[PDB]
Amino acid sequence: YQLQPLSLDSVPWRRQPGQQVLWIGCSDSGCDELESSGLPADEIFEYRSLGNMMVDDLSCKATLGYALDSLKIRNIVICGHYGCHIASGEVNAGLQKPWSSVLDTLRSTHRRTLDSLTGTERDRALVELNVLEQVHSLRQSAEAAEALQKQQLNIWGMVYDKATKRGYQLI
Amino acid sequence: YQLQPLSLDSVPWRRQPGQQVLWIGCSDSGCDELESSGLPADEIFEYRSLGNMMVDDLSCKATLGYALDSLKIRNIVICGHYGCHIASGEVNAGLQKPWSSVLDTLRSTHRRTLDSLTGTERDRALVELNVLEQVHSLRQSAEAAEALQKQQLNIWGMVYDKATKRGYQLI
Ligand SMILES: [Zn+2]
């Protein structure tokens, strides 16, 4: 992957006005994130969860299902954020499986690149890797895979930087 | 129950600055809701789900658990909103169980009250009843019940009115 700064005028998840976007963001990220989305408030259906993850439980399936079946959403954005307390090198004992399992697996699978980086740059890399893995795994959900095969769904990854108030798309 | 307009300078979930509040809101409600919270952005841990519900699923349990065990939160707010598409009318087929079950149970349990109202007033009553039920059910959870009996947790209910740009506490 590479990071591409977004231009707010032409975001990949808004090539046409009027349609609703499922925005999947993190519980410890603020509203300030959506100011970098390129979407007006009335085009946003917002799921906000631990580490902007979708794990295969009833909440992920029901939210995906309602978004596709009732709102006929054609775009999903997974928005990670720099400074995230959940997608970081600090392993918090209060964080349950499978959220903790996803993060352990990322740390082991990407050990080579992560091992060469100090704390702040390591945590930024882990936010980005978490967004990529969430985008890849949501594409393999049964409901998303059938929509993608009809070219009736796109899933996008982005990272928001609180400090610069800018978003970066994962390409 | 009765509705009490909130004053932003004296919200029951912020009697002292610095501590984090778990804010449970709806996916089809906007950030505009949090402007009525009386909280600065860095005191908000936001869980945003179908119909501002907590059902007994891994996501609800893990988010509650991370909030209590890792963030040591002392206040939970369940925020419903007038004009909600999920807590409205009768059956949406796109809305899965147990979300659909909660709403059917509210429609049956409060049939007498709902029958006394027209459609728009019926929808508003269903938003308010949903918040009260979510607050009552969350209090009965094993983790919440132990914390409440130690006076180390409060759960609050509120409803946000987009038209008046005000929140109302459920007393
Ligand atoms: Zn986060």
Ligand SMILES: [Zn+2]
């Ligand atoms: Zn927001």
Ligand SMILES: [Zn+2]
């Ligand atoms: Zn709603």
